[PDB]
Structures are given as structure tokens and as C-alpha cells.
PDB file of C-alpha atoms and ligand atoms in Angstrom:
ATOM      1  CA  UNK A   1     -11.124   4.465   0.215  1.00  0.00           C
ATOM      2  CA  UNK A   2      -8.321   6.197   1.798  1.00  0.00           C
ATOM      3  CA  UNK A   3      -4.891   4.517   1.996  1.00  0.00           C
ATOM      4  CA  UNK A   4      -2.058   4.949   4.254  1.00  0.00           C
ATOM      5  CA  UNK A   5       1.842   4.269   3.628  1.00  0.00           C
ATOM      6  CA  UNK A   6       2.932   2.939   7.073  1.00  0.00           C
ATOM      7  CA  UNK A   7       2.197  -0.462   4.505  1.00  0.00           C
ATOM      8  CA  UNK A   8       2.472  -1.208   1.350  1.00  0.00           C
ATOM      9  CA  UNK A   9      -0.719  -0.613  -0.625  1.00  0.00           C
ATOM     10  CA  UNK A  10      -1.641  -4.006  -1.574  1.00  0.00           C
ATOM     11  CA  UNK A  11      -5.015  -4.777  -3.432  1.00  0.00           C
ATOM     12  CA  UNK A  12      -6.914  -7.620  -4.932  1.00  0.00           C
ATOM     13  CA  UNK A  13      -7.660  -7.228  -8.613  1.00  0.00           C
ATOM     14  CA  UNK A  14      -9.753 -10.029 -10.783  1.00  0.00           C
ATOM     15  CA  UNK A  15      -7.712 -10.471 -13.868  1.00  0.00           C
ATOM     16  CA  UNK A  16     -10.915 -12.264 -15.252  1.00  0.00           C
ATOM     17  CA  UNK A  17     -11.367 -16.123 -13.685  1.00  0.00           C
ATOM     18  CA  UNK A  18      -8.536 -15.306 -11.221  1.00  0.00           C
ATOM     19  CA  UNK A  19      -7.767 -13.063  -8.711  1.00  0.00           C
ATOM     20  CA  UNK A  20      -4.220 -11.445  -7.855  1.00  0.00           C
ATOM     21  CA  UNK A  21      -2.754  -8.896  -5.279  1.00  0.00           C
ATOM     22  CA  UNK A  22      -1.109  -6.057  -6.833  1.00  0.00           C
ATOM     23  CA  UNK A  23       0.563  -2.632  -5.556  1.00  0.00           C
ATOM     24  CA  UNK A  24      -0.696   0.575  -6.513  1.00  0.00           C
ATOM     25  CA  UNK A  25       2.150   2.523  -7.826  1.00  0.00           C
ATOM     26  CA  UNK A  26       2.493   6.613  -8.494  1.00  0.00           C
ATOM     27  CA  UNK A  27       5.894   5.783 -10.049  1.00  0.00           C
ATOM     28  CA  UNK A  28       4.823   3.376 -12.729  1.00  0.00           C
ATOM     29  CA  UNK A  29       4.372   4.498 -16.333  1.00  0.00           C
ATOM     30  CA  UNK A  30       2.649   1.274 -16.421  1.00  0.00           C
ATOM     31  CA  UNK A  31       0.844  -1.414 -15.108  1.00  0.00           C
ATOM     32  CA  UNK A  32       2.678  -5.202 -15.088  1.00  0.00           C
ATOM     33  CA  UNK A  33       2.193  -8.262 -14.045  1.00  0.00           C
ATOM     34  CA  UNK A  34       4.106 -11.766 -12.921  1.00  0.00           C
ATOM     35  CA  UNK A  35       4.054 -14.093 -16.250  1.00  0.00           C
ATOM     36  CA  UNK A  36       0.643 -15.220 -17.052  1.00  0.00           C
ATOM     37  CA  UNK A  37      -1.194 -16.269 -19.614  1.00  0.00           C
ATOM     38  CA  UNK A  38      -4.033 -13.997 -21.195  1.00  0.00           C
ATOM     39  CA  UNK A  39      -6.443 -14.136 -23.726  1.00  0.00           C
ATOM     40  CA  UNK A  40      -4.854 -11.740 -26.378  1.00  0.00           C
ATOM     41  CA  UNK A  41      -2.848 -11.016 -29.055  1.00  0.00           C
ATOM     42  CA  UNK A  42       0.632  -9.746 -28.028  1.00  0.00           C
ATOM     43  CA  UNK A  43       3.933  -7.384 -28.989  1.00  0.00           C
ATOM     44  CA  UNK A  44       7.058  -7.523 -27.359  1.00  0.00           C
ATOM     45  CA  UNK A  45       8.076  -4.045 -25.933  1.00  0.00           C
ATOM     46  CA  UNK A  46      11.041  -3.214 -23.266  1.00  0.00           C
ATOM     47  CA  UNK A  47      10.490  -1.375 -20.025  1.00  0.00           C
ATOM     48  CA  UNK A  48      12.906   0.153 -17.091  1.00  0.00           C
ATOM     49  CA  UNK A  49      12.900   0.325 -13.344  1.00  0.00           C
ATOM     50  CA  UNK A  50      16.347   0.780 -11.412  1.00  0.00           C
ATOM     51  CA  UNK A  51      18.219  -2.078 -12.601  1.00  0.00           C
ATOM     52  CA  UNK A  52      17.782  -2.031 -16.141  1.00  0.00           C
ATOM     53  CA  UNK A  53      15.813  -2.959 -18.572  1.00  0.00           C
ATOM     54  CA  UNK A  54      13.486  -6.118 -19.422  1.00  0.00           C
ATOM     55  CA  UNK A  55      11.507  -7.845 -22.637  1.00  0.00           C
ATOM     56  CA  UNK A  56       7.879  -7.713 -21.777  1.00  0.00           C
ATOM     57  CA  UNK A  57       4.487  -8.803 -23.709  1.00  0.00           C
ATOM     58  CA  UNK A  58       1.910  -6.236 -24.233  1.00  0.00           C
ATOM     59  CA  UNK A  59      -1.745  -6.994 -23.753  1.00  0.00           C
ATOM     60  CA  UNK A  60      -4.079  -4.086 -25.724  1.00  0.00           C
ATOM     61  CA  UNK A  61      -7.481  -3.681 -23.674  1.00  0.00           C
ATOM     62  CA  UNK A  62      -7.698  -6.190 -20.812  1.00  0.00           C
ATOM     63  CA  UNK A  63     -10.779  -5.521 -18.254  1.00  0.00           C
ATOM     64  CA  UNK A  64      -9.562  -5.503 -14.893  1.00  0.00           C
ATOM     65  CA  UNK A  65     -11.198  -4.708 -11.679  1.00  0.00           C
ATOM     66  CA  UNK A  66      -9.073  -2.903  -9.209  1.00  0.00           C
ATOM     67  CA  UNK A  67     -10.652  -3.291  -5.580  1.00  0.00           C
ATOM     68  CA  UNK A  68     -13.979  -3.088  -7.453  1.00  0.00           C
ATOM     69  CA  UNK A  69     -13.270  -0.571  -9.435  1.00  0.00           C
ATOM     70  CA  UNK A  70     -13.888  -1.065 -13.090  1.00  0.00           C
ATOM     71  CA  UNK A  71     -10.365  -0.122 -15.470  1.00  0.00           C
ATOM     72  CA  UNK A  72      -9.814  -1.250 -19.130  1.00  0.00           C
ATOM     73  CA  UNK A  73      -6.473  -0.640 -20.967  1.00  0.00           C
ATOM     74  CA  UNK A  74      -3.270  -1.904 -21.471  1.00  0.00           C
ATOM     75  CA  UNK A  75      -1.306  -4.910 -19.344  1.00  0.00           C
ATOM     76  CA  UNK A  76       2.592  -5.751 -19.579  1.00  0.00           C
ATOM     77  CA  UNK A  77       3.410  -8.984 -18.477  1.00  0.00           C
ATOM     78  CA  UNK A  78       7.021 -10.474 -17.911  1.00  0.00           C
ATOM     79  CA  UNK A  79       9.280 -10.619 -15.216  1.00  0.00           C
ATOM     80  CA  UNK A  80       8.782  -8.155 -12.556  1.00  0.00           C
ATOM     81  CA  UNK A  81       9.200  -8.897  -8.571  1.00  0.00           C
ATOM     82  CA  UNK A  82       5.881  -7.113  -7.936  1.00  0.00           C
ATOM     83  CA  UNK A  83       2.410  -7.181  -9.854  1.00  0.00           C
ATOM     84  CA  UNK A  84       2.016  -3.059  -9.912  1.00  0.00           C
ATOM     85  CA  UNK A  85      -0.781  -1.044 -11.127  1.00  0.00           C
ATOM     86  CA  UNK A  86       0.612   2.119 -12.426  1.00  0.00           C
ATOM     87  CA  UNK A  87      -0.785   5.382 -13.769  1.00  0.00           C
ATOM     88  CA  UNK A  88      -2.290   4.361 -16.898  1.00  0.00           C
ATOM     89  CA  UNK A  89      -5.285   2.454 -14.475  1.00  0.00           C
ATOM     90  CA  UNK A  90      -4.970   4.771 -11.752  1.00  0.00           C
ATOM     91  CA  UNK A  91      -6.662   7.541 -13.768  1.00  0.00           C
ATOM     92  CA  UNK A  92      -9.511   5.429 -14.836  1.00  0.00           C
ATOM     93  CA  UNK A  93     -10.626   4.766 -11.115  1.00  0.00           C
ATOM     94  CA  UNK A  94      -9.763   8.442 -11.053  1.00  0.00           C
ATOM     95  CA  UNK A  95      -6.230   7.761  -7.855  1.00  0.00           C
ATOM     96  CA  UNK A  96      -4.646  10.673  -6.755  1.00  0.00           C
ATOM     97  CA  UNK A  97      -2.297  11.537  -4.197  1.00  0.00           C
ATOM     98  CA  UNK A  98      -3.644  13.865  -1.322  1.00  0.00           C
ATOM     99  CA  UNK A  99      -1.041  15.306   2.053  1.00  0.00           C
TER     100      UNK A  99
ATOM    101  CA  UNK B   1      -2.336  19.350  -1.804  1.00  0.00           C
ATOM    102  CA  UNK B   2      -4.333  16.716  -4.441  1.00  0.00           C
ATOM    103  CA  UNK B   3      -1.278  15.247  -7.318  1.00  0.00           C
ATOM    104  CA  UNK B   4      -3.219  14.216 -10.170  1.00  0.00           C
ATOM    105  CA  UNK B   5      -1.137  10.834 -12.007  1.00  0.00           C
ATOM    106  CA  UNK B   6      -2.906  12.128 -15.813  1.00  0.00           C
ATOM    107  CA  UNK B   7       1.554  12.420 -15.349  1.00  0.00           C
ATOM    108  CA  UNK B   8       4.676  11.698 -13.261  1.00  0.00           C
ATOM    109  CA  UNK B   9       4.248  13.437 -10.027  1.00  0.00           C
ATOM    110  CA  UNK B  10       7.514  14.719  -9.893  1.00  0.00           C
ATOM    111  CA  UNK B  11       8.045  16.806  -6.934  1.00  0.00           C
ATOM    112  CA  UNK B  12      10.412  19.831  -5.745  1.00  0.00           C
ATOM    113  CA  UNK B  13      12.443  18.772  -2.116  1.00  0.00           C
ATOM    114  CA  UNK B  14      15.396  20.457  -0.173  1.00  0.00           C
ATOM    115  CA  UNK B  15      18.504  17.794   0.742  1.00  0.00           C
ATOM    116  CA  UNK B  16      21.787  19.544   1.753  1.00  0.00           C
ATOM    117  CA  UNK B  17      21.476  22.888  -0.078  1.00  0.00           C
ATOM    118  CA  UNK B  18      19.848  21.846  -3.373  1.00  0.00           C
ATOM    119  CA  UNK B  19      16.349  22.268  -4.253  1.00  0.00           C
ATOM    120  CA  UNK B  20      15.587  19.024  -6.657  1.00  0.00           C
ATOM    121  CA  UNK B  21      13.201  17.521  -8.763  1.00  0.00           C
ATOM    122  CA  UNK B  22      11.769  13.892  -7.204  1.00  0.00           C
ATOM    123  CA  UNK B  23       9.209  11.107  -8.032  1.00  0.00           C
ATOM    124  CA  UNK B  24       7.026  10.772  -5.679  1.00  0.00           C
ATOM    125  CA  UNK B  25       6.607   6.539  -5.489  1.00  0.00           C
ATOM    126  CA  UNK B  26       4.780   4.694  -3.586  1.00  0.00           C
ATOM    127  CA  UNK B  27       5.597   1.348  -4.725  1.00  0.00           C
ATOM    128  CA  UNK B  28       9.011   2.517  -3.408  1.00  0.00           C
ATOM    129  CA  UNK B  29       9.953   1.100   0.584  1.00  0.00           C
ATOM    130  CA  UNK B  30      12.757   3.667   0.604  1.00  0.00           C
ATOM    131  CA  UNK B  31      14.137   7.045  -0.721  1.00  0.00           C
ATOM    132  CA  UNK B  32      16.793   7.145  -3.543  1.00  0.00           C
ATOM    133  CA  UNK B  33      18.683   9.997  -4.719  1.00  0.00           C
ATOM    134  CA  UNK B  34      21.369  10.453  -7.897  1.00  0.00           C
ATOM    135  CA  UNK B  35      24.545  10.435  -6.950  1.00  0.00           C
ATOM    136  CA  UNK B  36      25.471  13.331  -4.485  1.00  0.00           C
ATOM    137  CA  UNK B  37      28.127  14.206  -2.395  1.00  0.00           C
ATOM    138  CA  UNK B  38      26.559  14.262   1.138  1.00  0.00           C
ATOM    139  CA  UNK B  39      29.098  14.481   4.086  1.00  0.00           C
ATOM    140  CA  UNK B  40      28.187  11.637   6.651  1.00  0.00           C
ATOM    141  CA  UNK B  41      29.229   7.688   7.571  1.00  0.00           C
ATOM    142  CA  UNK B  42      27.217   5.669   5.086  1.00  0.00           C
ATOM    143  CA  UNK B  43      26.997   2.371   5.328  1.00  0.00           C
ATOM    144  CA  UNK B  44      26.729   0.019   1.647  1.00  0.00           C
ATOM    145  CA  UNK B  45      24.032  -1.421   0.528  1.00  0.00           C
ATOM    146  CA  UNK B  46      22.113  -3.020  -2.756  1.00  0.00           C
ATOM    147  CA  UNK B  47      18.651  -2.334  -3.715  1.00  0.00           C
ATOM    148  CA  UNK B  48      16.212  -3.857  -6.889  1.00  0.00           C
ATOM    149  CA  UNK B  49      13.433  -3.216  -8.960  1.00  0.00           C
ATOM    150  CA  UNK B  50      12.738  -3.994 -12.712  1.00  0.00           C
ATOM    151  CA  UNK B  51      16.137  -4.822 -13.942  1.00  0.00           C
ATOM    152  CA  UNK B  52      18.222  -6.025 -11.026  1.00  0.00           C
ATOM    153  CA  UNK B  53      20.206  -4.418  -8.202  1.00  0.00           C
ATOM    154  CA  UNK B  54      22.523  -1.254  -8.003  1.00  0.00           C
ATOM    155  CA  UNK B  55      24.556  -0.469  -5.066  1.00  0.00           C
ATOM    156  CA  UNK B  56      24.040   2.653  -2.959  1.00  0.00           C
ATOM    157  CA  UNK B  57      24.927   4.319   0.354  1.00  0.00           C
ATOM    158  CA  UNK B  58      22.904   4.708   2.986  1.00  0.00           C
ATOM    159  CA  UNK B  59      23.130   7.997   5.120  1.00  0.00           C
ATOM    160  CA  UNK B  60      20.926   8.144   8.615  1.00  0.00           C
ATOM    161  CA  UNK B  61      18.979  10.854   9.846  1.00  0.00           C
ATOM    162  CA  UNK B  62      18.875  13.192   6.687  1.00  0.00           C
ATOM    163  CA  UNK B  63      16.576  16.314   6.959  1.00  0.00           C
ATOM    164  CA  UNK B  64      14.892  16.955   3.745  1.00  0.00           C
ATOM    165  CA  UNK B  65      11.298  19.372   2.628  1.00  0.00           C
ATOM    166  CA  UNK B  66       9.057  17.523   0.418  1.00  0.00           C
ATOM    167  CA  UNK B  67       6.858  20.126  -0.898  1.00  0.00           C
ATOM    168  CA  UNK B  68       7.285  22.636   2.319  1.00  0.00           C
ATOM    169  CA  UNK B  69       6.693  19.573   4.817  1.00  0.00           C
ATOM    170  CA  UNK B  70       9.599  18.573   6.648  1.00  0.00           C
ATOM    171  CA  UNK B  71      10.828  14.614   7.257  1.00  0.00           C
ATOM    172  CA  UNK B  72      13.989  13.013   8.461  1.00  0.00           C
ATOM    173  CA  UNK B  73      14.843   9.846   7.354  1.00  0.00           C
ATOM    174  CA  UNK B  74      17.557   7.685   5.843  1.00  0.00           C
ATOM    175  CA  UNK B  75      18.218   8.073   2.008  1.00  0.00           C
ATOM    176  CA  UNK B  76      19.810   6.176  -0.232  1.00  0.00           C
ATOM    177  CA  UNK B  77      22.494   7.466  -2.906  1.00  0.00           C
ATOM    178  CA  UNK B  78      23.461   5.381  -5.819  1.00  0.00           C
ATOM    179  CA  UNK B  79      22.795   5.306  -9.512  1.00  0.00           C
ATOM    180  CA  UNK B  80      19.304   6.134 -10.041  1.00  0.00           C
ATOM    181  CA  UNK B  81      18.153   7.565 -13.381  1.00  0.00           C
ATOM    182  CA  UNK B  82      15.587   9.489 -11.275  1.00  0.00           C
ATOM    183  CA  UNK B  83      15.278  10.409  -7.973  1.00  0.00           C
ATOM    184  CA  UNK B  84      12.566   8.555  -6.199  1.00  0.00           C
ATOM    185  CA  UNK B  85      10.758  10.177  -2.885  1.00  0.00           C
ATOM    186  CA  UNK B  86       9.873   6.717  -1.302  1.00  0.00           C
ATOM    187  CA  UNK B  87       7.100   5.460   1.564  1.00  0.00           C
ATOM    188  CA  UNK B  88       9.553   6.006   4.463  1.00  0.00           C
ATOM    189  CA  UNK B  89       9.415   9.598   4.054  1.00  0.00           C
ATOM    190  CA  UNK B  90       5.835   9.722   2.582  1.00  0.00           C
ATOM    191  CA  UNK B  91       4.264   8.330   5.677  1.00  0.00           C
ATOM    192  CA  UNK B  92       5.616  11.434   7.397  1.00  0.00           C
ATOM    193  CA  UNK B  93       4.412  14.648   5.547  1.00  0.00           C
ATOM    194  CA  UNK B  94       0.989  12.444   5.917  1.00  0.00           C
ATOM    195  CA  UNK B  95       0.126  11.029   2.238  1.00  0.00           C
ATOM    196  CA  UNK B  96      -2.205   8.944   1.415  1.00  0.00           C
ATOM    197  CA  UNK B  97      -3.511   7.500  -1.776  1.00  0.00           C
ATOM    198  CA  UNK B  98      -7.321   7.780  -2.295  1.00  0.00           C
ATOM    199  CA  UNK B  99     -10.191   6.685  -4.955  1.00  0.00           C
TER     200      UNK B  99
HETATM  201  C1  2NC C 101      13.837   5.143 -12.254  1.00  0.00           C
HETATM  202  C2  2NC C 101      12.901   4.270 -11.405  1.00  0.00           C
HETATM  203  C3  2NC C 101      11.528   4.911 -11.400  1.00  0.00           C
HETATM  204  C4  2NC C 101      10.629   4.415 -10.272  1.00  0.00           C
HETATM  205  C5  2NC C 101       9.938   3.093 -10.320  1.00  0.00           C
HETATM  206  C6  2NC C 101       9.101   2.711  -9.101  1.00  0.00           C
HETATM  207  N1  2NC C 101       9.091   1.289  -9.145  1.00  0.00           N
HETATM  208  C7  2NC C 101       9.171   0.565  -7.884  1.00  0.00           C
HETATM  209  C8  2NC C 101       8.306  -0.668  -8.038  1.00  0.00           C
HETATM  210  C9  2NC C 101       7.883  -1.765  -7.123  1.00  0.00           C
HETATM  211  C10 2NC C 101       8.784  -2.983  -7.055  1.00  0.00           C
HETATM  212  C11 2NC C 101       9.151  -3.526  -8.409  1.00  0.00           C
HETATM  213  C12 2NC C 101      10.592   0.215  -7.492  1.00  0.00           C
HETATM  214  O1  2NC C 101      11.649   0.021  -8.103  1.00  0.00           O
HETATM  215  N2  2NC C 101      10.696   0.091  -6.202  1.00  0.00           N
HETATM  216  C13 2NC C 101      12.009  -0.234  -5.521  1.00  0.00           C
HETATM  217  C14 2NC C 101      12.810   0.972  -5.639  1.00  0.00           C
HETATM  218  C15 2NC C 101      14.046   1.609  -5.171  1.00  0.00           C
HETATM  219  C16 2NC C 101      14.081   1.063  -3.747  1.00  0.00           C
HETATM  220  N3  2NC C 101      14.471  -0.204  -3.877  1.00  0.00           N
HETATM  221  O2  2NC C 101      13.727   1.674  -2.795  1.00  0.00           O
HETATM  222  C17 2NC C 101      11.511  -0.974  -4.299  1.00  0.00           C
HETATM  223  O3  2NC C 101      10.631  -0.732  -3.431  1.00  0.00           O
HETATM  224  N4  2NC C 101      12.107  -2.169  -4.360  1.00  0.00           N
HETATM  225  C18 2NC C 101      11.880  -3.185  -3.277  1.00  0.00           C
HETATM  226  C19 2NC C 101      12.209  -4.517  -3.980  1.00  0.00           C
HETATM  227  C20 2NC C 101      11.131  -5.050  -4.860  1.00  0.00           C
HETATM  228  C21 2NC C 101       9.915  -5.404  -4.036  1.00  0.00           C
HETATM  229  N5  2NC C 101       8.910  -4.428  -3.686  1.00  0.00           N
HETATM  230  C22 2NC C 101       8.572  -3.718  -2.620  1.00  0.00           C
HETATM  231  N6  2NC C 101       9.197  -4.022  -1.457  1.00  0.00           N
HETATM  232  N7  2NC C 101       7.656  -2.709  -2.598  1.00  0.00           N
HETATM  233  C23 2NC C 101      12.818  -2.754  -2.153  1.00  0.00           C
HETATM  234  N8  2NC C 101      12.554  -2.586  -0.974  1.00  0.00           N
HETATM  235  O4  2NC C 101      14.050  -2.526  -2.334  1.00  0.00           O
HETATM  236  N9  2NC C 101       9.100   2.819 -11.555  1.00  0.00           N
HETATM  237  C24 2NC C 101       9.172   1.658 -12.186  1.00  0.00           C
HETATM  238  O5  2NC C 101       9.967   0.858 -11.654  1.00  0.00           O
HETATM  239  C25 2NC C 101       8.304   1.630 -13.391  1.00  0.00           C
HETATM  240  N10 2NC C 101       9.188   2.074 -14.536  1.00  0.00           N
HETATM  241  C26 2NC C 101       8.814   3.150 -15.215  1.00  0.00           C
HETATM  242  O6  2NC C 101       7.804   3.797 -14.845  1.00  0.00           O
HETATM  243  C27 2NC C 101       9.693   3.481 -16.405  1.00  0.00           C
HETATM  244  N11 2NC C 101       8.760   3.551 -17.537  1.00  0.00           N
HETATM  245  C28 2NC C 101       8.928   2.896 -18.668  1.00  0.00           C
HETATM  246  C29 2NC C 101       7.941   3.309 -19.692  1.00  0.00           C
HETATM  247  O7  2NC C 101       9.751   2.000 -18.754  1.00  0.00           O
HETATM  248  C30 2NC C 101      10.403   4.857 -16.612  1.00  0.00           C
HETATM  249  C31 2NC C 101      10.852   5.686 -15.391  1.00  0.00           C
HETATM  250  O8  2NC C 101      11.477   4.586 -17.592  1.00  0.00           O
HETATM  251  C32 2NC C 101       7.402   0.599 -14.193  1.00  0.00           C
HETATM  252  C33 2NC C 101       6.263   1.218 -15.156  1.00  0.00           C
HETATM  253  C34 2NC C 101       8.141  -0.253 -15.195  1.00  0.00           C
HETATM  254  C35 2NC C 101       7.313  -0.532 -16.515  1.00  0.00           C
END
């Protein structure tokens, strides 16, 4: 599908059991979520956005389904105001920006 | 054009009479620029991501070229440790996000 900006782009994902809205986002490294609980093993790593910096958990290989779409890789989880998919599962449903 | 995300898609605009290197975000509402000396009434404002808040000034009406396609929009200045090309501009050189 083709998707416009006039809104944010908001999509349902299955995060395996549950499902979750997230927002596909160009200016992500990476993807993260709200805290959850996953089945996993997990490391402690620190991201940035424009405030600062925050202690997140990585998640090694989680399946997730992006609108259908089949991606499996990595998922940070901690506390971010907004699920977001970034580029590291954009490229494996093969997103790209077109103007 | 077609942006791949395999990395950043960082961007060359025109604000003022600097040619500049942007992130092109759309999991950004607005557009937010490194510090820079614009002549204009701002009025303040605060903004957040991951992190928290920083405070920036918002200028009206500013002309810019993102990628040889002309916008106008408001802009923020603040902060930033990159500058991020955000949906309120993106919607107007046409962009969309496709898979
Ligand atoms: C230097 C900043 C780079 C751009 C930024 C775009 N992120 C969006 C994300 C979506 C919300 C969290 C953002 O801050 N958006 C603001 C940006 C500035 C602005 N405020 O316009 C926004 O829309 N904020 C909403 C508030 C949050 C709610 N969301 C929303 N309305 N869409 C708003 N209106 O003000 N990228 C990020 O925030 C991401 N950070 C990174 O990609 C960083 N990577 C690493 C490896 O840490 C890298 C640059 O150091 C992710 C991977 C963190 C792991």
C-alpha cells in the first residue's frame, strides 16, 4: 500500500498473542516499543531521540507482522511515547520513501 | 525520487541561504532545525521525543527546497543533534511511504 502524511502512519502489528498500533518511522535507527513483556532473553542498551537518552531492553529475533507483512529482527522495549517501527523492519517488508 | 532506508535518508534543503543536510522523518509532526540565526518574530515553544523536551522557536511561513521541491511552512529552531525534515513539510513536495 501507498501511504500519505496528511496523518500519521499508524499500523497494526501482532507482536505474537497481541496486537499493537505502531508508527512507521524513516528516522528511527530502530524499532521500540511501550514496556511489555516478551518471551526472550534480554541486554540493557541506551538509545537517543531529541531529549536525551534512555535505558532500554533488547529483544534478539522477535517475529512480528507489520500490516501483514512478515519481519524478524531485533525489538527495544522501554519507555518511549510512541511504539515506532524503524529502519531495521522497514527493509525487510522492503519500505521506501517515493515524491 | 525512491529513498531506500538500507540507511538514514538524510537529505540536502535550502533555508535562508544555506544548503543543509536533513533527516527526512516521518514519525516527526513538525520540522526542526539546529540552531540558526533566522531573522523573523518567533514565538517559544517545547517539543519531545525519546528523552524529554527541548525548547525551540517557532518561525511562520519559512520557504525552504527539499530536494528541488519547494514548501513553506513553519520550522522549529532549537537544540537538535540533527536536523529533522518533518510531515508538515513532507505532505507538500507529495511523499508517501509505500510497501
Ligand atoms: C535526533 C532525533 C532524530 C529523529 C528521531 C525521529 N523520532 C521521532 C519519533 C516519534 C515520537 C517518539 C521524534 O522525536 N518525533 C518528534 C520530533 C521532533 C518534533 N517534536 O517535531 C515528534 O513528532 N514528537 C511528537 C511527540 C511524541 C509523539 N508523537 C507524534 N506526535 N508523532 C510531537 N509532535 O512533538 N529518531 C528517533 O527519535 C530514533 N532515534 C534514533 O534513531 C537514534 N538512534 C540511536 C541508535 O539511538 C540516533 C539519531 O541517535 C529512535 C531509533 C530511537 C531508538
Amino acid at each position: 500500500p501507498q501511504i500519505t502524511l496528511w496523518q500519521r502512519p499508524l499500523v497494526t502489528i501482532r507482536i505474537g498473542g497481541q496486537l499493537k498500533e505502531a508508527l512507521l518511522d524513516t528516522g528511527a535507527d530502530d524499532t521500540v516499543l511501550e514496556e511489555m513483556n516478551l518471551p526472550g532473553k534480554w541486554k540493557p542498551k541506551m538509545i537517543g531521540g531529541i531529549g536525551g537518552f534512555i535505558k532500554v531492553r533488547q529483544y534478539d529475533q522477535i517475529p512480528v507482522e507489520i500490516a501483514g507483512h512478515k519481519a524478524i529482527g531485533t525489538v527495544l522495549v522501554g519507555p518511549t511515547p510512541v511504539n515506532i517501527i524503524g529502519r531495521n523492519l522497514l527493509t525487510q517488508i522492503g519500505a521506501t520513501l517515493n515524491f
